[PDB]
A paper describes a structure:
Except for an N-terminal region, Prp3 is highly conserved from yeast to human and contains a C-terminal domain of unknown function (DUF1115; PFAM ID PF06544). Here, we showed that Prp3 orthologs contain a C-terminal U4/U6 di-snRNA binding region that encompasses a DUF1115 domain and a preceding peptide rich in basic residues. Our crystal structure and targeted mutational analyses demonstrate that the DUF1115 domain acts as a ssRNA-binding domain that specifically recognizes the first 10 nts of the U6 3′-overhang. Our results indicate how Prp3 functionally bridges U4/U6 and U5 in the tri-snRNP by Prp3-RNA interactions on one side and Prp3-protein interactions on the other.
We also determined the crystal structure of yPrp3DUF1115, lacking the preceding basic peptide, at 2.0 Å resolution. While the ordered parts of yPrp3CTF and yPrp3DUF1115 are very similar (RMSD of 0.48 Å for 131 common Cα atoms), the β3a/β3b hairpin in yPrp3DUF1115 is positioned closer to the globular part of the protein, showing that its relative positioning is indeed flexible. The lower apparent affinity estimated by EMSA is likely due to the presence of non-specific tRNA competitor in this assay. The yPrp3 DUF1115 domain (residues 325–469; yPrp3DUF1115) lacking the preceding basic peptide showed ca. twofold reduced affinity for yU4/U6stem II+13nt in EMSA (Kd,app 1.83 µM; Figure 1C, second gel and quantification) and a ca. 3.5-fold lower affinity in ITC (Kd 380 µM). In any case, these observations show that both the DUF1115 domain and the preceding basic peptide contribute to the RNA binding. Finally, Prp3CTF, but not the DUF1115 domain, inhibits Brr2-mediated U4/U6 unwinding, suggesting that the peptide stabilizes contacts between U4 and U6, presumably by binding the stem II duplex.
Numbering used by the authors: 332 to 466
The structure:
Amino acid sequence: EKPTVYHCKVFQFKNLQNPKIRFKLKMNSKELSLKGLCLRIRDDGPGIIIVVGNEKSCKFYENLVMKRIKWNEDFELHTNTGDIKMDMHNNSISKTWEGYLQDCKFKGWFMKVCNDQDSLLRTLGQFDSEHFYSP
């Protein structure tokens, strides 16, 4: 019997190709010393964000993700072949789970692209988190 000190919030997004959005997610997780991860299915696919830490930091991060980042914002994308105008009008972010953990298996905060949905689920599985993803 021990206290439960870790808050946790989980978000799912449709597209995370905007490098400016990735930069904000990464830098705020780093500056807030949040733990968790951000996974998506292929470069241009849907994915999940999990953050774990204290209450204050998780609430700041929710406001960042749900209110301050413009997920629907068009941008120009630089690829191996050229530069293209991306249409993001259909992009969106949802908060799914929120709650408390007694312990977390996360080591820092990390971003990864997975090759398929099953790869993503397998990865969440290593952190006991596979249930957090809605296919």
